[PDB]
Amino acid sequence: SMLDDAKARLRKYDIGGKYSHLPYNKYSVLLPLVAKEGKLHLLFTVRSEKLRRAPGEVCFPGGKRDPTDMDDAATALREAQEEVGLRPHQVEVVCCLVPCLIDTDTLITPFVGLIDHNFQAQPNPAEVKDVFLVPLAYFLHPQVHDQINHIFEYTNPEDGVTYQIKGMTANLAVLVAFIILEKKPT
């Protein structure tokens, strides 16, 4: 099936906890995969302007590890719950993708999660000003704008609203799309 096929593809790129004990400032993100209308989508946030870390930006749910977290996946899940109301029973963490090194002292670990079909986002306005889906296939043929660096523009056909997706978030979206959608019969 579509979902078993995605999970089987993703597991081949799992690095596990290989880089998880290194002495960095540690953050995790959740790359939430949602199946709608027979296709896979990624769930994105627009972060509140009030935040210190990446205000107003399109991002994945996530944040800084704290002492309560059993592991890096727990960080991602705790933060996704705080930001969009995603509960533990509503997500299956499938793998840990290659981490992102930044600022010389920080490691951001991405986890891909399969989201239950009855989940409905409840944006927490203290954390996020918006939550939106993008079909995974978009990232194979994105609308690119050069700001010099590459920015994606996605327009939601439901309402005509345009979102700018850039940096780490854009890079990870492309990675997940390649992993799941490459070399597929029609």
Ligand X SMILES: Cc1ccc(-c2ccccc2N2CCCC2=O)cc1
Shortest Cβ distance from residue 155 to ligand X (Å)?
A: 22
Q: Which stretch binds ligand X (CB under 6 A): 14-22, 35-43, 51-59, 172-180?
A: 51-59
Q: Confirm or reject binding of residue 108 to ligand X (CB under 6 A).
A: yes
Q: Confirm or reject binding of residue 113 to ligand X (CB under 6 A).
A: no
Best CA proximity match to 133, nearest among 116, 155, 149: 155
182 annotated binding-site participant: no
Please identify, using beta-carbon distances, which residue of 9 and 24 lies nearer to ligand X: 24
83 annotated binding-site participant: yes
Q: Confirm or reject binding of residue 85 to ligand X (CB under 6 A).
A: no
Q: Confirm or reject binding of residue 168 to ligand X (CB under 6 A).
A: yes
Q: Are 136 and 152 in contact (CB under 8 A)?
A: no
Cβ-proximal residue to ligand X, closest one: 62
- Phi, psi dihedrals of residue 9, rounded to the nearest 5°: -65, -50
* Type of residue at 83: E
C-alpha distances out from residue 170 to 1, 69, 142, Å? 27, 27, 10
**Total chain residues near ligand X (CB under 6 A):** 13
Q: Confirm or reject binding of residue 132 to ligand X (CB under 6 A).
A: no
Q: Residue 45's CB: how many other CB atoms inside 10 A? A: 27
CA distance 149 to 88: 36
> Strand, helix or coil at 8?
helix
Task: Give, as ranges, the residues between 16 and 35 that touch ligand X (CB under 6 A).
Answer: 27, 29
What are the binding residues for Mg(2+)?
Answer: 79, 83
- Which residues are near ligand X by CB under 6 A? 27, 29, 53-54, 59, 62-63, 102-103, 106, 108, 167-168
